[PDB]
RNA sequence: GGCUCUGUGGGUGCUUGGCCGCUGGCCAGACCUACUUCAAAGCCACCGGGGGUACCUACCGGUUGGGGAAGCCCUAGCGGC
RNA sequence: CACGCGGGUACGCUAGCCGC
């Protein structure tokens, strides 16, 4: 640390404590598999829509598995995973649609 | 006057003061001190008096120590809300809502009113968190503290379900329970707001018999009135 | 602009934002407001017609 | 209110030391922005129309704390070039316009004197003390501070002159006169430790003029005897104490204070065979005072306060403990 | 040229040290009169240096009696001995400004190194004390215990009743 | 040596706040003049040094954005990402007013950034306090509107109508109609003078004083209707740009144009100049734009190309520049770095505001925040861009938070310090130099074989005999 | 890493504080038209000071019957002045109350030629009758003189020592004589050996004691010494000199007011050439007076003028004139060095102010900053045409303007005569003698 | 159940797409700063009436000192008209 | 000429020796 507690107190007194204030503020396996995905290869640098999902300025060729990973990252960026993707008798009655019958 | 309408929309959604008179008025709006001294009252003495009140609150109950760390600190003397980003503002909204649910039990005491006076005069709860602040002051709707909060509330920040307090802000008299339950049985929004507030408090285990009796009474009279509205005789309509 | 003080006015003798000398003491504005004319272009149209009439009277 | 202009001058004075702290690696630019913003807010509040000695004191405390934190960071980073000279200069400037804006606040005057005595400005300290005494003559605490620090320095003539002007002014409460007698007998003690003063007649002279000063009372003479009875290890101390008690006998023949000093008179240099003999002597005097014609309630309250002091002293006999408990219980 | 000037008031007397003295030749000018009137152009002339209150209302009564009779009091002599630099006018004198000429003479005969200037005879010290008496409620307020009105009220009643001997033979109420 | 940073500070201060090379003390001869010039050069060295030292007390910080990863670039940022990452006090400032039924809109901020005015071409003039959202005045104006522009304050605004121009007060009451200015199509308000400079359609430029009310100088640009106009504010001269392809620099002291830089082969379409006065960017009808270092009057780099004829251009307080072309605008960062002696072309634009089918009528910068207004045919769109904006204003010159008393004192002080219109040139710091011809004539009054052939040819057409011509003829006989 | 500039209004007002914050950036990029705005503020300064030049302050009471022919201030005091008129009455005024005089007496029979204050409190008057010593400040008013002298010839002027009780009187017999009060009676007469003509004015050097300068009507100045009671030096100029005055700040500089319409500043150690030649008048100068701060000069002329001068200028800093002033005879500063006093020949003692556009009293700090800023600005830009013409332009009365145009025509004519004489004479092979050299005709010891 | 007010959508003219650096692409966008041989033809371009014109400006005719495009010539040139 | 941090001679203290 090489800082005294009294020195840290003089720090918090003289200079301010915005960093610690911000700190106190901000306190299933895949069942089936394919083989065509391993066999595939696509040119990210070639296709202009796929140009925007590569990582470095070297990624042009990619197999279908890592390609699927990039598309999954890009889908998650465009639309986040909603919280409902992550019994009670009355709640079961509400969620049953046989009850609301005219 | 389409231009005037869009501009008034911008002016109501605006949050920061931008000329000196608007700054002086928005700093003059206060709970405890009269506005004549609330204009000329700077932030050091405010923090001194309200920190004394918050100290009395910590010697009342135990769980005010995290807010001693993060909301009533010597850096919160200085921090300005409108210069932080949206996510810092959201985290601040969460901390404010936690403190309001916590302070809702002991609101009839001068220590708690001093703490809320700090939160209003520095973090501008009455302009940024009107929903939760107004729901927390709602169960005490007879006391002069609620009358003053009704005074200092800005008219356009009041959300839609609580927009029935306009005649009382016009004439500063505390609204009666007949008015609250009547607005509850007409709008489902106020009823859902009160129930959401109280269920949030009871999940956070900071409830108290005053709030629980208030919520029970309002929803009971509200369900009575709502069924008395819903009864309509035609079989399909009542179904 | 505030009411000019003594020295400020002595330095800005010739200054006035409202009435220039090219505004003719706002005779256009006084007449337009007196007789409810809606178009200041129509005022100046009347004005140049009356001006041509006076110069014909001058040559006569 | 040209306070923007006045603050501009003071911040433009404070700028080059901050340039030094930036060219060194001691503070980084974010910290320096925090510093200059806090200094701007402080200077505007200081030069504002409505100000307070508490505001001046808080700015003083901040600047002094910045000096201390800078010293800590310098000693941590192993530098020697950066000094405290500019910091002490600006602190002196704050205090000077502080006592200009609020001359009548002894809180601020005492804080300013404390700052001078802390950072080692003795001549400046004497000048500040002189100005503060000229603004607050009736302050016994200020007079005692001047006299005591002068005698601590060793200026007996200057400590004298301060005390003499003080007792010429403050004539209402005897606190300053007690303090002058205290300092004078401390000077006699320092001389005896070094080994006219062979007589030691200056406290007797102070007593003889205190008799005619308008605070002169029985309780005043009691305080005089108390401060005379402290540190009885002296040469003419018995002479002084005898003169005090004879003067009190000649003035207040039956006052309970006079009876109290007749009780505690022979206990001047007692702490050991010399202790219990004087104890028995004063016990006989005490019983004679309790049976004689005197205001027994006031005398016994003085005596039980005195015995509260005695029982606060430890290392005594159980028999005399029980008899003092009995005599205190019979009152 | 003035250096210090006394000023006797009801709560007590104070002596001010003049800095940047006024011009005695153009003293009858509208500019210097306006500067005497306002407060932001008189505090540059006058800076407070020493104050002395009275210890008790009997002492203030003694003050008025001696001062109006013209004789200086002993504690006034004490305060001036504290504030004025000790000198005799063999080579360097100190110029004081007081109001009463007899008081000026008595202070001169007390301290040889103080030449006094009377407000009766010198217009510059006249205008200077006039400005100080006008702005007197603000210059002392930093150490003014209370206000000056009640002290003037009670002190005037004490002085006039002492001169009249009133309560000895008023009982009709 | 530890004095290396000392010499670096002194060199940097002498560069920035020097305003002149230095006095050569060694070459003076009189002793008293030597001493007073040593004293003066020392005082000026201390002045510039303490000014550079006092430049630390600036509170705010200049906005910026830099790319983090190697692949993502700066112009691929979106307004949503910006408004999520930025502070809420400017996230409020980013907004879009929708106005569709009243022609294309031109926006113009006041020079303190408080109030703006927007003019829809078919007659709709509005002045508003856009930060607070309250509008000062709004009017339908009937006929068309060429160009709206604020005056010195936010009090008076001048609208360039179909035939005359009209200046109005704060409530939109029409103060008066200037009819000497006929068919005005471009306007620029010199604000340190008080001059309204109007370019008509006819090519007749007119300079009218606004304080006194008399037109100071009429000039007739003899060639072509004017296509563009702006004001160099370091000189207060008028960069107008004609139709034959040249930009001409004018000033009210001459009928001839002061200079004429040559530009694109088509008519120049838009001009902008730095407030430092360093560089001018101009974009033509030919698809290029190009910059110019003005103080030396040469081209700095090769021409950039814009993929359409640019409708407008405007550069910020700092080095940013916004060219609004076609239907979407772009912003370049490093066109003209001040410190470099030789400039460099930039690969990519800093950032672009995209096209959703709105033709851009005019771009402007809010002069003191990090935002930028576009005026397009669908209305007004104030977007945010971080790098712009001079971070630290000067509350003696211009105050974005001006109180009433401060605005009144500012108006009367600028009225007392108005600049006479004759003091306008290509170097505005010249008042005090030697009138060399007058000085040589004064010193004269105190102190008192190829060319003669053409001289005799010139003097043989007079046909005065002229004893000097006689001596010259005798000399020509001698040769 | 996105970050824009965020400006709350706390930078304009701290909350709860009425103070108006004003952050400042000194970038020349942000403050344009530097030199031009400076020239314009200079022009406003010139127009302001030519508007507010109102120098006339007052008139000391009702004045005298006849003209004011001599006057003198009390160099020890500050508001004690006396003026001796022409009918032989002297009056003593106090400057605080300029309504009525403090002390008057019909002193002599002829005019009061010399007058001074002593160092104690008393005053001396000199007339052709003789000289007399009065005490004007006493608890009884005494109109009788307390000392009288007649022997020694017709006395003409007076001057008093700085510290001691000695004073010199310049007589008419070609001598001055020195008295030491309280132990001398007839005084010691010092004179040049063979000397006849009247010694008009006399003045003790103030900064260096015991050096006496005096001017005689042989168009000559003479310096004496007093520790060795003998004359020292004698220079003959081209015209007679009406007064000599020493400089109260530099020990060796003197100024002679001479009938050549000129004012010469001489160095007493080197009388070979004049140090400075102020030429601004129309008639003869009847009075000169150095400032007590030793940097400005007053010269009251025989015509209707008072000229204020700088020490190294050599031309009119300013000129005062008034129809009511019939002639001007004695002008002197007050020890403030801010108000000058002019005894006229109309019988008035007028009080003007120097620095005729600088008001008195205590100034507020921004006001004094604006004044000093205007003055330094003019000191820089005082030579451009517009500023120059408005700063020099002053209304002179018709007779003075007419006669000074004739004076310029005559001086240009004489210069052209001398120029043609040089060009067509054998004097061409010489250097032009400087005029500071041409001021002194001869010097002798 | 009624009056009044307020808001949203459709209509009030005959139905061929949203965007762009549009013979192609894009709606997740992609690339970003290159390319260059020669400045330009002239005219016109609305201010209410009578009136003065010191100053400035416009136009015309000149004047000192430079300046030399272009035209003409040949003794050929650092030329000559 | 001296002015920051350590150990000594010495403290309800800091005057003095050498380092960091």
């Amino acid at each position: 640390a090489e800082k005294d507690a009294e020195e840290e107190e003089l720090e918090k007194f003289v200079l301010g404590a915005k960093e610690t204030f911000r700190e106190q503020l901000f306190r299933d396996a895949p069942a089936w598999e394919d083989s065509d995905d391993e066999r595939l290869t696509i040119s990210l640098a070639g296709a202009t829509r796929l140009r925007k999902l590569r990582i470095s300025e070297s990624e042009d060729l990619v197999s279908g598995i890592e390609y699927a990973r990039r598309l999954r990252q890009q889908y998650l960026r465009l639309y986040p995973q909603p919280d409902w993707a992550k019994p009670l008798p009355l709640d079961s009655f509400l969620r049953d649609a046989n009850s609301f019958k005219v | 006057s389409s231009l005037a309408q869009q501009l008034a929309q911008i002016a109501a959604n605006s949050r920061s003061s931008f000329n000196v008179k608007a700054l002086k008025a928005s700093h003059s709006k206060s709970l405890i001190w009269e506005p004549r001294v609330a204009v000329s009252q700077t932030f050091a003495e405010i923090y001194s008096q309200c920190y004394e009140g918050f100290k009395e609150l910590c010697h009342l109950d135990s769980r005010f120590v995290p807010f001693d760390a993060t909301l009533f600190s010597a850096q919160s003397q200085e921090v300005d809300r409108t210069q932080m980003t949206a996510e810092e503002n959201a985290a601040l909204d969460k901390r404010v809502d936690s403190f309001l649910h916590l302070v809702g039990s002991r609101l009839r005491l001068m220590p708690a009113i001093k703490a809320v006076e700090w939160l209003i005069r520095r973090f501008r709860i009455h302009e940024f968190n009107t929903g939760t602040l107004l729901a927390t002051f709602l169960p005490y709707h007879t006391i002069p503290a609620f009358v003053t909060l009704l005074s200092i509330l800005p008219v356009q920040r009041i959300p839609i379900e609580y927009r029935f307090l306009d005649p009382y802000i016009k004439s500063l008299t505390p609204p009666p329970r007949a008015a609250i339950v009547q607005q509850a049985t007409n709008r489902p929004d106020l009823l859902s707001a009160i129930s959401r507030y109280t269920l949030d408090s009871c999940r956070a285990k900071q409830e108290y018999p005053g709030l629980i009796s208030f919520w029970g009474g309002i929803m009971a009279e509200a369900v009575n009135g709502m069924i008395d509205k819903m009864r309509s005789g035609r079989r399909a309509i009542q179904l | 602009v505030r009411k000019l003080k003594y020295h400020e006015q002595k330095l800005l003798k010739k200054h006035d934002f409202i009435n220039y000398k090219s505004d003719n003491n706002h005779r256009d504005h006084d007449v337009i407001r007196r007789y409810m004319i809606q178009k200041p272009e129509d005022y100046h149209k009347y004005n140049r017609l009356c001006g041509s009439l006076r110069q014909f009277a001058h040559r006569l | 209110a040209w306070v923007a202009d006045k603050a501009r001058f003071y911040l433009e004075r404070a700028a080059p030391e901050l340039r030094e702290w930036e060219e060194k690696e001691i503070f980084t630019k974010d910290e320096i922005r925090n510093l200059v913003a806090k200094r701007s807010d402080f200077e505007h509040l200081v030069l504002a129309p409505g100000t307070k000695p508490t505001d001046f004191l808080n700015y003083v405390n901040w600047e002094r704390s910045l000096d201390r934190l800078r010293a800590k960071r310098c000693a941590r980073l192993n530098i020697r070039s950066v000094t405290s000279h500019a910091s002490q200069a600006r602190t002196f400037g704050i205090f000077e316009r502080a006592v200009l804006k609020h001359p009548g606040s002894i809180e601020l005057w005492l804080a300013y004197l404390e700052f001078a005595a802390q950072v080692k400005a003795t001549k400046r300290w004497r000048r500040i003390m002189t100005r503060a005494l000229r603004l607050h003559p009736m302050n016994a605490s200020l007079w005692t501070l001047a006299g005591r620090r002068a005698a601590q320095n060793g200026d007996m003539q200057r400590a004298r002159a301060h005390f003499l002007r003080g007792c010429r002014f403050c004539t209402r409460e005897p606190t300053l006169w007690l303090e002058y007698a205290r300092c004078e007998m401390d000077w006699l003690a320092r001389m005896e430790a070094k080994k006219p003063a062979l007589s030691g007649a200056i406290p007797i002279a102070v007593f003889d003029v205190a008799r005619k000063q308008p605070f002169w009372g029985p309780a005043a003479a009691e305080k005089f005897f108390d401060v005379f009875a402290k540190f009885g290890h002296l040469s003419c101390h018995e002479r002084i104490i005898s003169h005090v008690v004879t003067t009190m006998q000649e003035l207040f023949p039956n006052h309970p204070c006079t009876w109290s000093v007749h009780i505690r008179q022979p206990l001047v240099g007692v702490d050991t065979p010399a202790f219990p003999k004087a104890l028995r002597e004063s016990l006989a005097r005490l019983k004679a005072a309790l049976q004689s014609t005197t205001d027994r309630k006031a005398l016994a309250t003085k005596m039980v306060a005195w015995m509260d002091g005695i029982l606060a002293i430890e290392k005594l006999d159980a028999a005399i403990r029980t008899v003092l408990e009995h005599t205190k219980r019979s009152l | 040229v003035v250096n210090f000037l006394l000023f006797e008031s009801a709560v007590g007397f104070s002596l001010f040290e003049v800095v940047h003295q006024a011009d005695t030749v153009g003293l009858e000018l509208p500019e210097v009169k306006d500067a005497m009137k306002t407060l932001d152009k008189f505090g540059k002339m006058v800076k407070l240096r020493s104050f002395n209150p009275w210890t008790s209302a009997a002492q203030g009564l003694e003050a008025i009696n001696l001062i109006s009779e013209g004789i200086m009091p002993e504690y006034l002599k004490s305060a001036l001995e504290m504030n004025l630099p000790q000198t005799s006018g063999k080579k360097s004198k100190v110029v004081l400004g007081v109001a009463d000429k007899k008081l000026a003479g008595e202070i001169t005969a007390a301290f040889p190194g103080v030449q006094c200037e009377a407000a009766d005879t010198s217009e510059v010290v006249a205008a200077l004390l006039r400005g100080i008496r006008t702005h007197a409620n603000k210059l002392h307020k930093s150490l003014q215990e209370g206000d000056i009105g009640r002290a003037q009220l009670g002190l005037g009643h004490a002085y006039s009743r002492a001169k009249v001997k009133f309560s000895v033979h008023k009982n009709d109420n | 040596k530890a004095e290396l940073d000392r010499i670096r500070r002194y060199k940097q201060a002498q560069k920035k706040y020097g305003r002149g090379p230095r006095v050569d003390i060694k070459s003076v001869r009189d002793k008293k003049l030597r001493r007073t010039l040593t004293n003066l050069e020392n005082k000026y060295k201390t002045a510039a040094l303490k000014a550079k030292e006092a430049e630390i007390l600036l509170e705010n910080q200049t906005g910026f954005l830099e790319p983090e990863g190697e692949l993502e670039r700066t112009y691929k940022v979106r307004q949503d990402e910006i408004v999520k990452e930025v502070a809420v006090e400017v996230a409020q400032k980013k907004f879009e007013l929708k106005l569709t039924e009243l022609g294309p809109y031109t926006c113009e901020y006041s020079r303190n950034g408080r109030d703006l005015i927007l003019a829809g071409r078919k007659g709709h003039v509005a002045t508003m306090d856009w930060r607070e959202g309250k509008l000062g005045c709004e009017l339908q104006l009937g006929e068309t509107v060429r160009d709206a522009r604020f005056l010195h304050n936010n009090q008076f605004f001048a609208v360039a109508q179909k035939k005359y121009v009209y200046i109005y007060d704060h409530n939109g009451v029409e103060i008066h109609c200037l009819r000497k200015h006929v068919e005005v199509s471009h306007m620029e308000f010199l604000p340190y003078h008080f001059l309204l400079a109007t370019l008509s359609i006819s090519g007749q430029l007119k300079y009218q004083d606004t304080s006194t009310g008399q037109i100071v100088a009429e000039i007739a640009t003899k060639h072509g209707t004017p296509v563009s106009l702006t004001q160099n504010p370091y000189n207060a001269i008028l960069h107008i740009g004609q139709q034959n392809g040249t930009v001409t620099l004018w000033s009210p002291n001459s009928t001839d144009p002061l200079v004429k830089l040559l530009a694109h082969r088509g008519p120049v379409r838009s001009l902008a100049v730095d407030r430092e006065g360093r560089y001018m960017v101009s974009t033509g009808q030919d698809n290029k734009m190009c910059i110019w270092d003005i103080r030396n009057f040469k081209e700095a780099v090769n021409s950039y190309f814009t993929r359409a004829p640019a409708t407008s251009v405007a550069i910020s307080d700092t080095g940013l520049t916004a060219v609004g072309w076609g239907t979407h605008t772009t912003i370049w960062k490093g066109l003209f770095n001040k410190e470099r002696p030789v400039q460099v072309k930039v690969d990519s634009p800093y950032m672009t505001w995209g096209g959703q089918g709105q033709v851009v009528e005019r771009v402007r910068w809010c002069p003191f925040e990090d935002i930028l207004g576009i005026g397009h045919n669908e209305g007004f769109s104030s977007i945010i861009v971080p790098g712009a904006g001079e971070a630290n204003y000067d509350a003696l010159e211009v105050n974005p938070f001006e109180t009433k008393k401060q605005r009144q004192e500012g108006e009367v002080k600028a009225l007392l310090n108005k600049l006479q219109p004759e003091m306008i040139a290509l170097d505005p710091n010249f008042i005090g130099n030697l009138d060399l011809r007058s000085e040589k004539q004064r010193q004269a009054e105190r102190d008192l074989n190829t060319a003669l052939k053409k001289y005799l040819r010139k003097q043989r057409k007079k046909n005065i005999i002229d004893e000097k011509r006689l001596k010259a003829e005798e000399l020509y006989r001698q040769m | 890493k996105i970050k824009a500039l965020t400006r709350s209004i706390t930078a304009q007002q701290a909350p709860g504080s009425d103070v108006q914050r004003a952050p400042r950036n000194l970038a020349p990029e942000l403050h344009p038209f530097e030199r031009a705005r400076e020239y314009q503020r200079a022009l406003n300064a010139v127009k302001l000071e030519r508007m507010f030049a109102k120098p006339f302050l007052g008139q000391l009471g009702n004045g005298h019957v006849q003209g004011v022919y001599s006057m003198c201030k009390d160099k020890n005091s500050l508001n004690c002045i006396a003026s001796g008129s022409g009918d032989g009455v002297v009056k003593v005024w106090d400057l605080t109350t300029r309504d009525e005089e403090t002390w008057r007496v019909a002193a002599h029979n002829n005019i009061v030629k010399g007058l001074t204050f002593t160092n104690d409190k008393k005053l001396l008057s000199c007339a052709t009758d003789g000289i007399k010593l009065w005490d004007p400040y006493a608890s009884p008013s005494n109109t009788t003189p307390i000392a009288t002298w007649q022997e020694g010839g017709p006395y003409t002027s007076l001057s008093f020592h700085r510290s001691a009780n000695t004073f010199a009187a310049s007589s008419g017999q070609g001598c001055i004589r020195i008295w030491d009060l309280e132990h001398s009676t007839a005084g010691q007469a010092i004179q040049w050996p063979s000397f006849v003509d009247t010694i008009t004015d006399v003045c003790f050097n103030q900064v260096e004691t015991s050096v006496i300068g005096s001017v005689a009507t042989d168009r000559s100045i003479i310096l004496f010494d007093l520790r060795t009671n003998m004359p020292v030096i004698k220079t003959v100029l081209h015209f007679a000199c009406n007064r000599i005055v020493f400089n109260p700040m530099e020990a060796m500089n003197l100024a002679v007011a001479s009938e050549d319409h000129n004012i010469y500043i001489f160095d007493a150690r080197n009388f070979d050439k004049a140090l400075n030649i102020q030429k601004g008048h129309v008639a003869a100068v009847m009075d000169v007076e150095f400032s007590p701060t030793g940097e400005e000069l007053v010269s009251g002329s025989y015509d209707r003028t008072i000229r204020l001068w700088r020490r190294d200028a050599g031309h009119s800093r300013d000129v005062y004139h008034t129809k009511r002033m019939q002639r001007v005879f004695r002008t002197m500063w007050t020890m403030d060095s801010k108000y000058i006093l002019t005894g006229s020949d109309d019988g008035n003692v007028r009080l003007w102010r120097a620095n005729a556009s600088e008001r008195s009293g205590v100034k507020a700090t921004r006001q004094r900053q604006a004044l000093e800023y205007n003055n330094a600005l003019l000191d820089r830009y005082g030579h451009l045409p517009e500023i120059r013409r408005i700063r020099r332009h002053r209304h002179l009365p018709k007779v003075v303007k007419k006669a000074t145009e004739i004076k310029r025509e005559e001086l240009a004519a004489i210069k052209r005569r001398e120029e043609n004489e040089r060009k067509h004479s054998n004097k061409k092979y010489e250097k032009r003698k400087s005029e500071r050299e041409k001021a002194v005709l001869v010097k002798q010891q």
Side-chain angles (χ1 to χ4, degrees), chain C residues 24-27 29 31-40 43-59:
Chain C
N24 290 315
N25 311 107
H26 301 300
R27 194 75 63 89
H29 304 158
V31 158
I32 281 163
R33 269 172 48 144
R34 180 57 63 109
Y35 291 107
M36 196 54 191
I37 319 178
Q38 305 182 309
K39 309 152 298 303
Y43 169 76
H44 291 291
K45 281 157 195 174
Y46 283 138
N47 199 8
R48 84 185 36 169
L49 193 137
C50 185
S52 171
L53 201 50
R54 267 155 81 190
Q55 75 172 354
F56 175 81
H58 191 284
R59 271 102 178 95

Side-chain angles (χ1 to χ4, degrees), chain F residues 44 61 68 368 390-391 416, chain G residues 1 3 7 12 44 380:
Chain F
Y44 286 158
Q61 266 163 326
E68 293 85 341
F368 276 127
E390 183 65 27
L416 285 186
Chain G
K1 326 175 269 205
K3 163 183 175 170
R7 277 183 209 153
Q12 177 77 26
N44 276 355
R380 170 175 296 169

Side-chain angles (χ1 to χ4, degrees), chain G residues 133-179 181 183-189:
Chain G
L133 195 156
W134 288 269
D135 184 21
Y137 299 97
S139 62
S141 294
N142 45 330
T143 65
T144 187
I146 84 164
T148 312
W149 289 270
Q150 319 93 316
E151 50 251 16
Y155 293 89
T156 40
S157 160
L158 289 176
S159 159
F160 211 93
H161 202 202
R162 189 194 152 82
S163 173
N165 268 30
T166 60
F167 80 101
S170 165
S171 89
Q173 292 173 341
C175 58
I176 70 172
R177 55 179 63 240
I178 303 170
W179 280 278
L181 264 62
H183 38 92
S184 177
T185 300
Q188 169 187 16

Side-chain angles (χ1 to χ4, degrees), chain G residues 200 202-288 290-312:
Chain G
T200 316
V202 61
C203 198
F204 273 105
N205 185 321
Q206 293 290 147
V207 290
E208 161 74 15
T209 47
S210 88
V211 168
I212 300 188
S214 78
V215 176
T217 185
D218 292 323
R219 318 155 298 114
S220 43
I221 80 174
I222 50 179
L223 291 188
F224 291 77
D225 204 308
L226 192 145
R227 297 155 297 122
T228 62
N229 318 271
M230 60 181 72
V232 163
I233 210 167
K234 167 153 185 263
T235 73
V236 195
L237 303 95
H238 282 68
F239 286 76
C241 308
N242 283 83
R243 196 171 159 91
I244 198 175
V245 162
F246 274 75
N247 187 36
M249 280 303 142
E250 310 161 345
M252 59 292 289
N253 295 6
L254 57 96
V256 280
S258 90
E259 194 269 332
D260 198 35
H261 321 86
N262 281 343
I263 297 269
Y264 302 99
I265 308 184
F266 279 128
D267 186 10
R269 317 186 321 279
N270 195 341
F271 273 148
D272 293 329
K273 55 182 194 41
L275 201 59
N276 219 344
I277 304 180
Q278 285 89 15
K279 33 165 64 176
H281 278 98
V282 184
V285 288
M286 298 301 293
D287 193 11
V288 71
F290 264 113
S291 61
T293 178
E295 197 176 0
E296 310 89 308
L297 276 82
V298 193
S299 164
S301 148
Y302 196 77
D303 66 345
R304 276 78 76 184
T305 34
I306 286 95
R307 292 201 174 274
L308 297 182
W309 278 335
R310 305 209 45 80
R311 203 262 318 273
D312 62 72

Side-chain angles (χ1 to χ4, degrees), chain F residues 44 61 64 68 275 368 390-391 395 401 416-418 431, chain G residues 1 3 7 12 23-24 28 31 33 35 40-41 44 380:
Chain F
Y44 286 158
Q61 266 163 326
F64 81 111
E68 293 85 341
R275 37 170 288 280
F368 276 127
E390 183 65 27
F401 316 107
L416 285 186
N417 307 1
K418 86 184 299 284
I431 310 170
Chain G
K1 326 175 269 205
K3 163 183 175 170
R7 277 183 209 153
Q12 177 77 26
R24 306 210 47 246
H31 293 283
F33 294 88
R35 206 181 277 179
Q40 186 72 211
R41 285 155 160 196
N44 276 355
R380 170 175 296 169

